[PDB]
Amino acid sequence: ESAFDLGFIRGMTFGFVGQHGTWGTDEARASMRALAEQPFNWVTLAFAGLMEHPGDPAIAYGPPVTVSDDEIASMAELAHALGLKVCLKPTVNCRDGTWRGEIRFEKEHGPDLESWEAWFGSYSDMMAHYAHVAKRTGCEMFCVGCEMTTAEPHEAMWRETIARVRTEYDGLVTYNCNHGREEHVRFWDAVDLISSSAYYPIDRWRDRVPVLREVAEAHEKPLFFMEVGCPSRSGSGACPWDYRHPGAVCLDEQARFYEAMFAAMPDEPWFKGYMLWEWPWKLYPREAASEDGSYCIYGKPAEDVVARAFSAIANR
């Protein structure tokens, strides 16, 4: 169905970074079952192809690097049988640890150089491949990119990648920008839904909503969060995007983040919901949650905070 008619998204991201073999495990199947017991109507299957360095245009994806096409199909099939809609979200990470939002090339053109042209060649090839996987596996959404801040001004190359995806895939298409980039992306017209990694600090939510509304209304597209969440660590609510943030385990900090977000987001048709970050393919037991400092909400007060809000939206 169309974008404005879409049911409000109550989602969870699963299985990142999608290392080869991990989703084909009994653990992954048990973890997906646990995810589906929460009041989620969506799951995002997220995984990363690999670049050697942020200036290398070559991208390694598929086995032995990523989960296989069969592993993706297995997870999509399981999620679908459990009543979830599925977004497929391929992305790229750098082996040297450089954030994908900082990839950069010295040249725009040159197919045998380290150019934006060469990289988008590799990236378009990868996205076409997974767009075809998404079609074959009946995925209801496909995400053409995540947090690609340095790549964004290459509008023509993004439009090509999107047109290539459209060729392979006729479901809903989004691009996932970083927090603070919602108003900066210039190709929102080429996708069906505007999405962002909305890691806004606890105290920034109320202030940020107006611009988010303005972005949705300006481009006449619904907007949702392709990533939102907070680690259960002390002070993390001030820097939700940072998985490396040092601090004692703190379950309340994560809960406060979710409460602040839910409090600030209006019940207005331009806003289409939440794809939470994140759920592991190997899920810890409930009792171990008090020791866990990750983004996962399982077994923590945030689980209940999320369940209450999502159930209320669901049972309406």
What is the separation of C-alpha 158 from the centre of its chain, rounded to a whole number of angstroms? 18
How far apart are alpha carbons 76 and 84 in whole angstroms? Answer: 9
How far apart are alpha carbons 34 and 283 in whole angstroms? Answer: 9
Cβ pair 118, 150 in contact under 8 A: no
191 φψ region: left (φ > 0), alpha (ψ -120 to 50), beta (else) = beta
Residues 6+ apart with CB under 8 A from 222: 3, 4, 6, 193, 194, 216, 269, 270, 271, 272
Q: Is 195 helix (H, G, I), strand (E, B) or coil?
A: strand
How far apart are alpha carbons 166 and 163 in whole angstroms? Answer: 5
Cβ pair 283, 236 in contact under 8 A: no
Strand ranges in the chain using DSSP code E only, listed in sequence order: 9-14, 42-51, 85-94, 141-146, 172-178, 193-197, 223-228, 271-279
| 206, two tokens | 């109320």
Q: Angle, to 10 degrees, between the axis of helix 301-314 and the axis of helix 251-264? A: 30
**CB count, 10 Å around CB of 284?**
15
How far apart are alpha carbons 282 and 107 in whole angstroms? Answer: 41
List, as one string, the DSSP characters of 141-185: EEEEEES-TTTTT-HHHHHHHHHHHHHH--SEEEEEEETT-TTT-
Each residue of 39-75: b (16+ CB within 10 Å) or e? bbbbbbbbbbbbbeebebbebbbeeebbbbbebbbbb
Experiment used for this model: X-ray
Q: Which of the listed CATH numbers 3.40.50.300, 3.50.50.60, 3.40.50.2000, 3.20.20.80 matches domain 1-316?
A: 3.20.20.80
How far apart are alpha carbons 174 and 131 in whole angstroms? Answer: 12
Among 39, 35, 29, which Cα is nearest to 13's? 35
**CB count, 10 Å around CB of 4?**
13
Each residue of 243-262: b (16+ CB within 10 Å) or e? eebeeebbbebbbbbbbbbb
| 69, two tokens | 């096409």
- The domain locations on the chain are 1-316
How far apart are alpha carbons 75 and 220 in whole angstroms? Answer: 33
Q: For 150-153, which contacts have Cβ atoms below 8 Å and span 24 or more sequence positions?
A: 150/101, 150/102, 150/103, 150/104, 151/103, 151/116, 152/177, 152/181, 152/184, 152/185, 152/186, 153/186
How far apart are alpha carbons 120 and 124 in whole angstroms? Answer: 6
